[PDB]
């Protein structure tokens, strides 16, 4: 499965995007971003309820999608869709890497152990800072 | 029910199936009631219920893991009245899980074995 996100939690690397040079990186788990009515005129929804991050880290795309579904589902159960319009104010652009080594019992033979250690792309990640909004909701004042 | 008799039939001891049902011997593979004690063989005394297979008998019952009563053994045990006793051969008789001998027992049946099991008394000729 996926490696534990305690490995890729803190942003210690230079940022590393999908480009001409990072070729075959898999896609992001968060597919759609902006959810709600979203054809709503801005006079309708006056209330800006945010979710800002208090520590700087690498919020993984797999985490943003789970939080997105968890935020969509509870309001869709509560007051139905089109009672809100949230975007998501963070995009997973920094891609993670894994120097994958075999789980074999005779693993000295096969894997170049820390030789050519530069990992292959797994997933993506969003580099949030302290006080950077990740989930901005626009909704009516009857849903504070 | 009854007392401790001297156990002289371990695991791997063949004994003559005194039973008119089809066996010629009984090979004791474990005794019902033995637990524990690292490297000790499960022994059977008299009166014991053993799990046994037949190594010699009618072929329609020959590779099954059947249940038997040890009705006599030649390891001498003292009854608690002081008298000892030991029989001529080890012997067995096939039953069900409950302890119902469905055949007829031949030879003398030890009366430490007609105690716990009623139907071993009601198919015995000689209870000694």
């Amino acid at each position: 499965g996926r490696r534990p996100a305690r490995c890729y939690r803190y942003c210690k690397n230079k940022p590393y995007i999908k480009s001409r040079y990072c070729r075959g990186v898999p896609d992001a788990k968060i597919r759609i971003f902006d959810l709600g009515r979203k054809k709503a005129s801005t006079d309708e929804f006056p209330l800006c309820v945010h979710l800002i991050s208090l520590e700087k880290e690498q919020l993984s795309s797999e985490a943003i999608e789970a939080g997105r579904i968890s935020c969509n589902k509870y309001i869709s159960k509560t007051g139905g869709k089109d009672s809100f319009h949230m975007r998501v104010r963070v995009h997973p652009w920094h891609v993670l890497r894994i120097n994958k080594m075999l789980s074999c019992a005779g693993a000295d033979r096969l894997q170049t152990g820390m030789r050519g250690a530069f990992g292959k792309p797994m997933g993506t990640v969003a580099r949030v800072n302290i006080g950077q909004i990740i989930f901005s909701i626009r909704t009516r004042d009857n849903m504070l | 029910s009854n007392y401790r008799v001297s156990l002289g039939l371990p695991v791997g001891a063949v004994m003559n199936s005194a039973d008119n049902s089809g066996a010629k011997n009984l090979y004791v593979i474990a005794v019902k009631g033995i637990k524990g004690r690292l490297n000790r063989l499960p022994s059977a005394g008299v009166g014991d219920m053993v799990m046994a297979t037949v190594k010699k008998g009618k072929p329609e019952l020959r590779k099954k893991v059947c249940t038997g009563l040890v009705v006599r053994q030649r390891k001498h045990w003292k009854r608690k009245d002081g008298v000892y006793i030991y029989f001529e051969d080890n012997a067995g008789v096939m039953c069900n899980p409950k302890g119902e001998v469905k055949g007829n027992i031949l030879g003398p049946v030890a009366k430490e074995c007609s105690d716990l099991w009623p139907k071993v008394a009601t198919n015995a000729g000689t209870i000694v």
Binding site: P26, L102, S103, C104, A105, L110, P121, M122 | -
Partner: protein, 250 residues
């Protein structure tokens, strides 16, 4: 002769393998234990992810990786991550250290599922357990193949015992009798579980309903209408053979 630490040992693993035999040689690669049925169904599992290693193997137990002397000769290429896709699609799933288990437990899962589907006995038909046909399918001496489909394999094991024994190969029908007050929570439990007809409910008398049920599902429904109610409820036979079960021979 007396080295203080003995030499290299076998490469025991937990990793599935796929075969492709091309130009006289036997090429395998290491894959995932379930994610190769995630590849030959049309579903994508991100070709980086479906492999436990990208370098192509001669023998996956010996851990022997091929060379480009016998790769440009075999495949017509030497780029390994294109070799691994041809071996994945045009190969057949070979089997690891757990082959004997994932074949014997497979052929003992197969007889413990496909044989036990819809089977009632002779003499005013009743269902029964699985171990009776686990006796009576070795007794008919069935040899189980997997490449014939499981529904067809269900229709194959009961053909032999329609030929041999007197067994029924259809549905049945029941006429459930339940009292009105203490049986409605028994009604709405089996009403989305099985099919009903002739829902005839009263106030003064008893709810009488008729069923559309397989032959084998009766023994559950004899007991679940007592262990929930807590009283007596009556099993009355309606009919013994209805079609659109396995009688259409799908």
């Amino acid at each position: 002769m007396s080295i203080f630490t003995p030499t290299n040992q076998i490469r025991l693993t937990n990793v599935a393998v796929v075969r492709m035999k091309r130009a006289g040689k036997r090429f395998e690669i290491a894959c995932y234990k379930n994610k190769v049925v995630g590849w030959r169904s049309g579903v994508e599992k991100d070709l980086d992810e479906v492999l436990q290693t990208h370098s192509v193997f001669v023998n996956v137990s010996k851990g022997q990786v091929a060379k480009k002397e016998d790769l440009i000769s075999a495949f017509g290429t030497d780029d390994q991550t294109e070799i691994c896709k041809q071996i994945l699609t045009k190969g057949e799933v070979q089997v690891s250290d757990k082959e004997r288990h994932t074949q014997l437990e497979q052929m003992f899962r197969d007889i413990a599922t496909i044989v036990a589907d819809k089977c009632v006995n002779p003499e005013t038909k009743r269902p029964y357990t699985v171990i009776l046909i686990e006796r009576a399918m070795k007794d008919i001496h069935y040899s189980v193949k997997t490449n014939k489909s499981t529904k067809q394999q269900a229709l194959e094991v009961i053909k032999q015992l329609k030929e041999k024994m007197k067994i029924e190969r259809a549905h049945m029908r029941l006429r459930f009798i339940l009292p009105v007050n203490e049986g409605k929570k028994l009604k709405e439990k089996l009403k989305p579980l099985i099919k009903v007809i002739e829902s005839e409910d009263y106030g003064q008398q008893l709810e009488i309903v008729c069923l559309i049920d397989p032959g084998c599902f009766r023994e559950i429904d004899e007991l679940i209408k007592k262990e929930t109610k807590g009283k007596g409820s009556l099993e009355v036979l309606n009919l013994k053979d209805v079609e659109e079960g396995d009688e259409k021979f799908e």
